[PDB]
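#struct-pred

JT: dropping the chains for the assembly here, can someone run the whole complex?
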Amino acid sequence: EADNQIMGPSSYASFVVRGENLVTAVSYGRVMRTFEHFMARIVDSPEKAG
Amino acid sequence: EADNQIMGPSSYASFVVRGENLVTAVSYGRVMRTFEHFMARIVDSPEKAG
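RK: done, full complex below.
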């Protein structure tokens, strides 16, 4: 065998419906994942290419 | 005539789609008027009865 062990993530990641996502939930029923990424993509410099 | 004139507003109001309103407009295709009110009701202190 090449390696005996592998390094892995110790804990789960956290998806919590925070404040800015919750307003979409109660109103439209469509919460989204990583809303702050959407704000940074189409509000804070949308002309910056991905 | 009790009045010759009435005092009123001078300009129209401005309903401009700001940033998080653009985000929900782009993603879910629905804008809510005064998003800061929805954020100050459903997120910041919902225990205060309207």
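JT: nice. DSSP finds two helices and no strands in chain B. The first helix of chain B runs from residue 19 to 27.
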